[PDB]
Amino acid sequence: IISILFKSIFEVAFLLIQWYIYGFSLSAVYTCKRDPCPHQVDCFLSRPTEK
Amino acid sequence: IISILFKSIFEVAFLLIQWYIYGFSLSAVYTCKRDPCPHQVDCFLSRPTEK
Numbered sequence: 447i448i449s450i451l452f453k454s455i456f457e458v459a460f461l462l463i464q465w466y467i468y469g470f471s472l473s474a475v476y477t478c479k480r481d482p483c484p485h486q487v488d489c490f491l492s493r494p495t496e497k
Numbered sequence: 498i499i500s501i502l503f504k505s506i507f508e509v510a511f512l513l514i515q516w517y518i519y520g521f522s523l524s525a526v527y528t529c530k531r532d533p534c535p536h537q538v539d540c541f542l543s544r545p546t547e548k
């Protein structure tokens with residue numbers, strides 16, 4: 447019983463972390479506002495739809 | 498008298514236009530926010546102090 451409970455708990459925790467961090471989709475264009483980049487810049491990903 | 502007056506008027510008008518448009522100094526770094534430039538970009542001039 448403990449093993450099954452821990453399996454379920456880990457699954458739920460990983461799902462929640464993924465939802466909080468990334469979500470469940472990816473966009474083609476990303477906006478970056480981190481140094482040393484001046485102001486904001488546009489970056490492009492690879493294979494967003496397939497991922 | 499008319500010639501002198503028009504000379505003075507032209508001088509004053511040109512000074513006012515210059516003040517309104519540029520001012521009386523130039524900076525080394527300029528910020529550009531015009532299409533097709535994405536977001537804002539930084540540009541650098543030539544010989545600002547001498548000018």
Ligand SMILES: CCCCCCCCCCCCCC
Nearest residue numbers: 455456457459460463466467
């Ligand atoms: C089962 C794995 C548990 C991992 C816990 C670590 C939490 C990750 C950090 C939470 C976000 C922090 C944002 C500053």
Ligand SMILES: CCCCCCCCCCCCCC
Nearest residue numbers: 469470471472473474494495
């Ligand atoms: C069992 C439920 C499966 C449906 C999950 C749908 C998640 C939302 C996906 C939205 C994608 C939007 C693409 C632009």
Ligand SMILES: CCCCCCCCCCCCCC
Nearest residue numbers: 506507508510511514517518
């Ligand atoms: C003696 C020369 C007179 C020139 C008059 C032209 C004025 C220039 C335009 C004024 C600024 C317009 C901002 C939209």
Ligand SMILES: CCCCCCCCCCCCCC
Nearest residue numbers: 520521522523524525545546
């Ligand atoms: C007869 C008056 C002459 C003085 C004109 C000064 C104009 C202001 C210039 C400011 C330059 C600042 C450099 C950073």
